[PDB]
Scaffold this active site. Structure first.
Site, PDB file in Angstrom:
ATOM      1  N   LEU A  43      21.574  69.625  62.836  1.00 15.44           N
ATOM      2  CA  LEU A  43      22.196  70.277  61.678  1.00 15.44           C
ATOM      3  C   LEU A  43      21.847  69.592  60.372  1.00 15.44           C
ATOM      4  CD1 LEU A  43      25.751  71.213  63.013  1.00 15.44           C
ATOM      5  CD2 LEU A  43      23.711  72.664  62.899  1.00 15.44           C
ATOM      6  N   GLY A  44      21.697  68.277  60.418  1.00 13.45           N
ATOM      7  CA  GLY A  44      21.353  67.487  59.247  1.00 13.45           C
ATOM      8  C   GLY A  44      21.207  66.021  59.558  1.00 13.45           C
ATOM      9  N   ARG A  45      20.667  65.283  58.597  1.00 13.91           N
ATOM     10  CA  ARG A  45      20.495  63.849  58.679  1.00 13.91           C
ATOM     11  C   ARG A  45      20.917  63.325  57.326  1.00 13.91           C
ATOM     12  NH1 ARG A  45      14.607  61.952  59.415  1.00 13.91           N
ATOM     13  NH2 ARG A  45      14.961  61.953  61.678  1.00 13.91           N
ATOM     14  N   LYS A  47      22.427  59.563  55.242  1.00 10.75           N
ATOM     15  CA  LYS A  47      21.960  58.194  55.114  1.00 10.75           C
ATOM     16  C   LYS A  47      22.437  57.315  56.269  1.00 10.75           C
ATOM     17  CE  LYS A  47      21.625  57.504  50.438  1.00 10.75           C
ATOM     18  NZ  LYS A  47      21.412  58.418  49.283  1.00 10.75           N
ATOM     19  N   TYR A  48      23.543  57.696  56.899  1.00 14.49           N
ATOM     20  CA  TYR A  48      24.089  56.895  57.990  1.00 14.49           C
ATOM     21  C   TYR A  48      24.140  57.568  59.362  1.00 14.49           C
ATOM     22  CZ  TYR A  48      25.525  53.777  54.217  1.00 14.49           C
ATOM     23  OH  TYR A  48      25.536  52.935  53.127  1.00 14.49           O
ATOM     24  N   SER A  49      23.733  58.827  59.444  1.00 12.28           N
ATOM     25  CA  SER A  49      23.771  59.516  60.727  1.00 12.28           C
ATOM     26  C   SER A  49      22.954  60.802  60.789  1.00 12.28           C
ATOM     27  CB  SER A  49      25.224  59.809  61.118  1.00 12.28           C
ATOM     28  OG  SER A  49      25.778  60.821  60.298  1.00 12.28           O
ATOM     29  N   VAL A  51      23.343  64.631  62.566  1.00 12.25           N
ATOM     30  CA  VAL A  51      24.371  65.515  63.075  1.00 12.25           C
ATOM     31  C   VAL A  51      23.745  66.653  63.844  1.00 12.25           C
ATOM     32  CG1 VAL A  51      26.307  67.004  62.376  1.00 12.25           C
ATOM     33  CG2 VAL A  51      26.009  64.799  61.253  1.00 12.25           C
ATOM     34  N   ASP A 154      35.317  59.823  49.721  1.00 12.99           N
ATOM     35  CA  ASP A 154      34.102  60.625  49.616  1.00 12.99           C
ATOM     36  C   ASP A 154      34.475  62.086  49.617  1.00 12.99           C
ATOM     37  OD1 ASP A 154      31.334  60.944  49.233  1.00 12.99           O
ATOM     38  OD2 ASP A 154      30.895  60.904  51.430  1.00 12.99           O
TER      39      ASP A 154
HETATM   40  N1  GAB Z   1      28.688  68.329  59.899  1.00 15.99           N
HETATM   41  C1  GAB Z   1      29.800  67.671  60.405  1.00 15.99           C
HETATM   42  C2  GAB Z   1      30.772  68.369  61.131  1.00 15.99           C
HETATM   43  C3  GAB Z   1      31.916  67.729  61.569  1.00 15.99           C
HETATM   44  C4  GAB Z   1      32.116  66.388  61.288  1.00 15.99           C
HETATM   45  C5  GAB Z   1      31.171  65.673  60.548  1.00 15.99           C
HETATM   46  C6  GAB Z   1      31.458  64.281  60.090  1.00 15.99           C
HETATM   47  O1  GAB Z   1      30.595  63.582  59.563  1.00 15.99           O
HETATM   48  O2  GAB Z   1      32.677  63.871  60.313  1.00 15.99           O
HETATM   49  C7  GAB Z   1      30.007  66.317  60.130  1.00 15.99           C
END
Ligand code: GAB
Length: 327
Positions: A43-45, A47-49, A51, A154
């Site tokens: 779903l995405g990247r 700076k720290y993870s 997803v 954040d």
């Molecule tokens: N995209 C997504 C969905 C649910 C939780 C998180 C999170 O970083 O807590 C991210």
């Protein structure tokens, strides 16, 4: 040096609790089964993870897996402990499991599934009623986490996941969240530029839950005025100047005088002299249907330099702006 500050609510919530609650370093993580989850798509990247959309094959339910980059020890246990402390709270993303990822060899947080749409995708097209409705939902999450001794640090549109069809919201990404301890100095390198409070921009470290209320005000201003972002800084310094062009420089100098802050001399050449603008200056034919006297009064009470003067989350929920929202 600077004058100390304390939160005016939930000040001593952590002080009374056993160390099991806030001493995240001493927490023992109970590991789940990584084979229960099949990754479907990235779903995405950040700076720290990284997803991923995944499936929990034990119930065929969709989940979200956040695979932590190896960064940075203490930060990992902090997020886990905060998520476990807040689990079940109103509009708080639910941590379903914690597994060790076989590839990265790092922790992978498994969350309940939320639609792959963040609030930034929807918040510029909502009706007046929906802005009020979703703001009230975000406030339930903030009062809950603040009452539990935690600041999010954040708050921004990307960290609000929304299922508009179902009128449901979750506050996500607790990776910058921290336990509030009265008198503690915190890192000011938190929040995203456009949502950073003046306390962060002037390097005032003894901040509190009220930082989240400034960030929430920035989101409100961006919604009611249809201006993304509302305070459009080119960097962290110009960010404060953009704020000063709206709130004025006299109240900025009163804030720094009150807390005995020494303003970075980089500001002497860029800050200028600005008077506070009346909120009606930002109203135009394209946003007027989202603006009311109650919205402007509420916004005015969030967007204050002095973090001690801002509405708390519970006081915000009491505001007349929300009287039209069905409860
Ligand atoms: N995209 C997504 C969905 C649910 C939780 C998180 C999170 O970083 O807590 C991210």
């Amino acid at each position: 040096g600077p004058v100390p500050s304390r939160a005016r609510v939930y000040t001593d919530v952590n002080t009374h609790r056993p160390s099991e609650y806030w001493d995240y370093e001493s927490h023992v993580v109970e590991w789940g089964n990584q084979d229960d989850y099949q990754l479907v798509r990235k779903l995405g990247r950040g700076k720290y993870s990284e997803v991923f959309e995944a499936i929990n094959i034990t119930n065929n339910e969709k989940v979200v897996v956040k695979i932590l980059k190896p960064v940075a020890a203490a930060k990992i246990k902090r997020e886990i402990k905060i998520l476990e402390n807040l689990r079940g709270g109103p509009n708080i993303i639910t941590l379903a499991d914690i597994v060790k990822d076989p590839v990265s060899r790092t922790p992978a947080l498994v969350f309940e599934h939320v639609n792959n749409t963040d609030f930034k995708q929807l918040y510029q097209t909502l009706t007046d009623y929906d802005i009020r409705f979703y703001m009230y939902e975000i406030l339930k999450a903030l009062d809950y986490c603040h009452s539990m001794g935690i600041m999010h640090r954040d708050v921004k549109p990307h960290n609000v996941m929304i299922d508009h069809e179902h009128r449901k919201l979750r506050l996500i990404d607790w990776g910058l969240a921290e336990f509030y301890h009265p008198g503690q100095e915190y890192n000011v390198r938190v929040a995203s530029r456009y949502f950073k409070g003046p306390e962060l921009l002037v390097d005032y470290q003894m901040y509190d839950y009220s930082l989240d209320m400034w960030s929430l005000g920035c989101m409100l201003a961006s919604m009611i005025f249809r201006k993304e972002p509302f305070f459009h800084g080119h960097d962290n310094y110009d960010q404060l100047v953009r704020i000063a062009k709206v709130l004025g420089t006299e109240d900025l100098y009163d804030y720094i005088d009150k807390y005995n802050i020494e303003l970075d001399p980089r500001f002497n050449d860029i800050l200028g002299r600005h008077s506070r603008k009346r909120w009606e200056r930002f109203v135009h034919s394209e946003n007027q249907h989202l603006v009311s006297p109650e919205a402007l009064d509420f916004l005015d009470k969030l967007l204050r330099y002095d973090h001690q003067s801002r509405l708390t989350a519970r006081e915000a929920m009491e505001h007349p702006y929300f009287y039209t929202v069905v409860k």
